Amino acid sequence: EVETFAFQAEIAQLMSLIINTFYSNKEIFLRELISNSSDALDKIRYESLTDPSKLDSGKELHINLIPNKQDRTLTIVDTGIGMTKADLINNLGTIAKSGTKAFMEALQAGADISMIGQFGVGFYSAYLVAEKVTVITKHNDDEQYAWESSAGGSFTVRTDTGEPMGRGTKVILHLKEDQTEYLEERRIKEIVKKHSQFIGYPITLFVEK
Numbered sequence: 001e002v003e004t005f006a007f008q009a010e011i012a013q014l015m016s017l018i019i020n021t022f023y024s025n026k027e028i029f030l031r032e033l034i035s036n037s038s039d040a041l042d043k044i045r046y047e048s049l050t051d052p053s054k055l056d057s058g059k060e061l062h063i064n065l066i067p068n069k070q071d072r073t074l075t076i077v078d079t080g081i082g083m084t085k086a087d088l089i090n091n092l093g094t095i096a097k098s099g100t101k102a103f104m105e106a107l108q109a110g111a112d113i114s115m116i117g118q119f120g121v122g123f124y125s126a127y128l129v130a131e132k133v134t135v136i137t138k139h140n141d142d143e144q145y146a147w148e149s150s151a152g153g154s155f156t157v158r159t160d161t162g163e164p165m166g167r168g169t170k171v172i173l174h175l176k177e178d179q180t181e182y183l184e185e186r187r188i189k190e191i192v193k194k195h196s197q198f199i200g201y202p203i204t205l206f207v208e209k
């Protein structure tokens with residue numbers, strides 16, 4: 001069963017701005033997604049200090065970058081806290097409402113698209129390079145879910161039928177035809193070195209066979 005939801009008015013407006021604005025510095029999408037993954041990892045690591053059983057679903061705390069030239073997809077895998085059904089539909093969207101409003105007010109006031117992370121809505125920078133984003137997530141307190149959006153004001157949430165994750169999040173970016181440079185080993189290495197060199201978790205770039 002697939003449930004369809006409309007994005008909050010402010011979010012739909014932000015997504016339209018990210019997709020239609022001419023902005024060449026698209027590489028910032030990777031540091032934003034890596035930062036979300038890093039925050040999820042910080043969360044589970046902190047929680048595990050008072051409750052060690054929170055790591056029964058996996059002890060390894062890492063980030064995996066998986067480019068796929070055949071499928072034209074860039075996958076970001078983390079073994080972070082994951083997201084519940086409530087996080088995907090209500091909680092993160094509620095927090096994102098105030099952040100989006102502030103970011104759009106700042107953009108009008110002279111700020112550029114790269115400052116998106118300061119407003120906590122960095123996830124949506126994925127739409128600078130992706131036509132569709134799929135989020136596979138598993139939190140200790142919930143089942144495995146699949147969130148998906150090609151923008152256009154709506155998103156879908158379904159219980160994931162695929163391979164079990166244990167704990168964490170998989171962000172699958174179905175890249176735009178002209179954004180294939182983000183599938184190149186050399187380009188990903190350069191972006192990670194320039195923007196994510198001090199992330200406190202191992203970042204493993206999966207080389208294509």
Ligand SMILES: Cc1cn(-c2cc3c(c(CC(C)C)c2)C(=O)NCC3)c2c1C(=O)CC(C)(C)C2
Pocket residue numbers: 033036037039040043078080081082083087088089092093095096120121123135147169171
């Ligand atoms: C804000 C925001 C932030 N993120 C987001 C995106 C991600 C993660 C998190 C949680 C950590 C920051 C603790 C949040 C995460 O756990 N891993 C990478 C993807 C999303 C949003 C959304 O509005 C849509 C969403 C729920 C599909 C994803």
